[PDB]
């Protein structure tokens, strides 16, 4: 079999929101639910208010990279939805990739 990491977000966002668990810090909410697979999958939901397209797309690239490159510390078998918060929006231009990575991994490790 091949390697997959993308979540069926349109299909499953409501399910994960309702039936999943959640963790949060000042920058992110993470929703997660067991997926019956031997790997975890990621969806990213960025509210329009987070910023214009370029900023939203940058956040998405960052989060995808963090998920892709740190699977050794991210529990397996979960569908995971990452939602950036207003405070991250407010501080986004003052923080770097590595700061965002620390804050996201802190949550993903606790699933
Ligand atoms: O979706 C959620 C969410 C879902 C389940 C539990 C808590 C939250 C939550 O606390 C939250 C925020 O604080 C926020 O600022 C934007 C959000 O989108 C959420």
Author numbering: 5 to 115
Sentences from the paper on this structure:
Furthermore, purpurin, a competitive inhibitor which behaved as the most consistent hit across our assays, was shown to bind the P protein by X-ray crystallography, with its binding site corresponding to part of the 5′-leader binding site. We next determined that purpurin binds to the P protein with micromolar affinity in a dose-response relationship. Finally, the crystal structure of T. maritima P protein in complex with purpurin (DSupplementary Figure S21 and Table S2) shows a binding region of the compound located in a hydrophobic patch formed by residues Val 33, Leu 35 and Ile 87. Additional hydrogen-bonding interactions are observed between purpurin and Gln 28 and Arg 89. Arg 89 is a conserved protein residue, essential for efficient T. maritima RNase P activity, that potentially contacts the pre-tRNA leader binding region. Remarkably, purpurin interferes with the binding of the leader to the P protein. Nonetheless, we succeeded in obtaining the crystal structure of the P protein in complex with purpurin, which binds in a region important for the 5′-leader interaction with the protein. On the other hand, several lines of evidence point to purpurin as a potential inhibitor amenable to further optimization. This compound maintains inhibition even at remarkably high concentrations of MgCl2 (100 mM) and ammonium acetate (400 mM), shows a dose–response relationship in binding the holoenzyme, binding P protein and displacing pre-tRNA, and it presents a specific binding site on the P protein, as revealed by the co-crystal structure.
The focus of this work is Ribonuclease P (RNase P), the only ribozyme other than the ribosome that is present in all three domains of life (see for some reviews). While in archaea and eukaryotes, RNase P is comprised of one RNA subunit and four to ten proteins, in bacteria, this complex is formed by an RNA subunit (P RNA, 350–400 nucleotides, 110–125 kDa) and a single protein (P protein, ∼110 amino acids, 13 kDa). The P protein, on the other hand, binds the distal 5′-leader region of the pre-tRNA substrate, enhances the affinity of metal ions, and assists in product release.
